[PDB]
Amino acid sequence: LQEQLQDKQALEGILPVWFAEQGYRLWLAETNRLEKEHKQAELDQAQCRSQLEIQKGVVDQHRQRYLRNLAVIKAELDQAEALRESLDQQLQRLIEQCVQLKTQFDQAASATRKAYRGAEKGLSDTQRELAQAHFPILSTDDLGDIDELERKHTRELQGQLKTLGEKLGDQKTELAKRMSDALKADTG
Numbered sequence: 001l002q003e004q005l006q007d008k009q010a011l012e013g014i015l016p017v018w019f020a021e022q023g024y025r026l027w028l029a030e031t032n033r034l035e036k037e038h039k040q041a042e043l044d045q046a047q048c049r050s051q052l053e054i055q056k057g058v059v060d061q062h063r064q065r066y067l068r069n070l071a072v073i074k075a076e077l078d079q080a081e082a083l084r085e086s087l088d089q090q091l092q093r094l095i096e097q098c099v100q101l102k103t104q105f106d107q108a109a110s111a112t113r114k115a116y117r118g119a120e121k122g123l124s125d126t127q128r129e130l131a132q133a134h135f136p137i138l139s140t141d142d143l144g145d146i147d148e149l150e151r152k153h154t155r156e157l158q159g160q161l162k163t164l165g166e167k168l169g170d171q172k173t174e175l176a177k178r179m180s181d182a183l184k185a186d187t188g
Helices: 001-065 070-117 123-134 145-185
Strands: none
Touching: 001 070, 001 123, 001 145
């Protein structure tokens, strides 16, 4: 019973490090994805700003030509200014997305770093070898499933430890009673 209890204690000690390592891998992947998305959003916002400058120049040229049967030129200006507002709107949307992306990116980084600070423990070795056969490998879609599975394994192992402790206490009481009976039979 003592040996079984020790084995369960060892497994319970091993579990959290492995789960933290899996979480670190998942958060690193997520951070890489969000980094790529944020960089693409920044490129798009630079492109849209350049387009806005070009459209402003076009509007300025149209209005300058009109201000000097000239009303037709005004029509051109109208078209230009119309495009301008749409482009302006696009910029706004993009900015929001960029900000959103950046915010999300930051979160991922923090998570990764947090997970990096959670999975920096060493001595993986044969302990990690046992963990890979005792605990599942978690996928990036298992964002909250890490906590769920870790808590489930912890509860199961705690119940096993409690049952083993109950059995060990019962066996110790049995041994004490048997030794007492032997002493009673013993003459000295």
